[PDB]
Design a binder for this molecule. Structure first.
Ligand SMILES: CCOP(=O)(Cn1ccc(NC(=O)c2cc(Oc3cnc(C(=O)N4CCC4)cn3)cc(OC(C)C)c2)n1)OCC
Ligand SMILES: OC[C@H]1O[C@H](O)[C@H](O)[C@@H](O)[C@@H]1O
Length: 445
């Protein structure tokens, strides 16, 4: 009963989800205004991706996705045929700890490997780059890294042109040639990839290691950009929502602990409630509190349970996947150096559920804010929209998307939302934006 009382702190009322949604809407309006942009927690970064007429260039497009690293070859043929090939690459700590130069040298090396395994190192291809970090764009192929997120810390990157860093590393290597045609956020790439299959897709969302959304905003509303005709995609960077104290009445001890011990204290607070980088850690801290209060594992925690990041977000998914026999739960805890009881297993499950349900409900508040804002901007009484979604939390968590879809739909009564689970959106969309941008780019000279 004391266990249940502690887990009940994660609960959120429909009245406070509505408070969060309206606060997100207020923060979104702030990010778009020239007057409040520099102070605004939700940056609402213009992407330079504009509503496009039918079709794109036909051909072979290379895609890079950083934010594991992925190289993708996308074949666009002609009605339309889109075929993909991919390779995954694990980033070594050295490439993460050092310079931006070392990071882009390892990315270049991965590109060479992909080119050799696909018998194409002699081909000079157009390249789309998904770079899943806040970027101030000057165009579709030029953007400066505002700051790292999700524990990324390579020196000499912030304030520099990310496209320039990649081009330099390709030149230093001298093993292949590529035309870097576009750089997009993963939300943007996901939206573009799902748009290919559904033209009503005007929102891209990520629920992975981090959490973010982008959407098609009226050009009239984008004050940081010249023009009043059509629409442009805006990268909300909503992970930073709560950084100017917007979420203070909702933050728990476990949230402030995760934040204090993170690579970016005081930053990405909304994200820190939802993202897979943080989810497992919130659970480990809830479990440690139960152990300290002698309510779980007879007050005896292991050296492994006491280590930061030892409770992987994958364990949270696995725990909530458990059939009922508690065998999955027992095995995770046994490997973690613990000897749990059956009751201990049930406690671990309930803690996992408390953290993930809060993540889904917090996430739905943000997405509803975006959809409700668009409905107003488009003066649509009944707005029919598609949301393209990528990320391991949304895709692989046992009940996250069910809990998330219902909560979004309760906050959006006047909307008909379709959710597309994007299989390879983050990577595929970088190539498709390149294919669309290449109608103009390949003719610049
Ligand atoms: C559009 C013109 O704007 P610009 O000023 C900036 N700019 C450069 C790119 C760019 N916009 C886009 O990439 C772009 C691409 C979109 O997704 C696709 C996917 N597939 C095909 C397709 O038909 N396919 C058949 C095979 C795939 C087409 N579009 C959707 C989109 O908006 C909607 C979400 C409203 C914008 N804007 O162009 C100059 C570079
Ligand atoms: O990877 C999902 C998201 O993670 C973080 O929130 C990044 O700041 C954002 O740019 C990205 O879209």
């Amino acid at each position: 009963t004391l266990v249940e009382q502690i887990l009940a702190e994660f609960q959120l009322q429909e009245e406070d989800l509505k408070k969060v949604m309206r606060r997100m809407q207020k923060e979104m309006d702030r990010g778009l205004r020239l007057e409040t942009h520099e102070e605004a927690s939700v940056k609402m970064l213009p992407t330079y991706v504009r509503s496009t007429p039918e079709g794109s260039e036909v051909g072979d497009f290379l895609s890079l996705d950083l934010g594991n690293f992925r190289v993708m070859l996308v074949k666009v043929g002609e009605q339309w045929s889109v075929k993909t090939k991919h390779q995954m690459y694990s980033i070594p700590e050295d490439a993460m700890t050092g310079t931006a130069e070392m990071l882009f040298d390892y990315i270049s090396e991965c590109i060479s490997d992909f080119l050799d395994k696909h018998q194409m190192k002699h081909k000079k291809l157009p390249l789309g780059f998904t770079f899943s970090f806040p970027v101030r764009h000057e165009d579709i192929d030029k953007g400066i890294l505002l700051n790292w997120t999700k524990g990324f810390k390579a020196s000499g990157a912030e304030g520099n042109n990310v496209v320039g860093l990649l081009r330099d590393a390709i030149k230093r290597r001298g093993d292949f040639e590529m035309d870097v045609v576009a750089m997009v956020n993963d939300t943007v790439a996901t939206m573009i990839s799902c748009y290919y299959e559904d033209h009503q897709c005007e929102v891209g969302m990520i629920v992975g290691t981090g959490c973010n959304a982008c959407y098609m905003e009226e050009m009239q509303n984008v004050e940081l950009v010249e023009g009043d005709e059509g629409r442009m995609c805006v990268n909300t960077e909503w992970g930073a929502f709560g950084d100017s104290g917007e979420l203070d009445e909702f933050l728990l001890e476990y949230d402030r602990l995760v934040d204090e011990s993170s690579a970016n204290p005081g930053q990405q607070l909304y994200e820190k409630l939802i993202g897979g980088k943080y989810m497992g850690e919130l659970v480990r801290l809830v479990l440690l509190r139960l152990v300290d209060e002698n309510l779980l594992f007879h007050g005896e925690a292991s050296e492994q349970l006491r280590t930061r990041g030892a409770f992987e977000t994958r364990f949270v998914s696995q725990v909530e996947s458990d059939t009922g026999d508690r065998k999955q739960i027992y095995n995770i805890l046994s490997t973690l150096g613990l000897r749990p009881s059956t009751t201990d297993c049930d406690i671990v499950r309930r803690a996992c559920e408390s953290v993930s349900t809060r993540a889904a409900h917090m996430c739905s508040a943000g997405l509803a804010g975006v959809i409700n804002r668009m409905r107003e901007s488009r003066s649509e009484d009944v707005m029919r929209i598609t949301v393209g979604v990528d990320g391991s939390v949304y895709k692989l968590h046992p009940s996250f998307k069910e809990r998330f879809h219902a909560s979004v739909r309760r906050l959006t009564p006047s909307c008909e939302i379709t959710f597309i689970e994007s299989e390879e959106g983050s990577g595929r969309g970088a190539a498709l934006v390149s294919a669309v941008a290449c109608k103009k780019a390949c003719m610049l000279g």
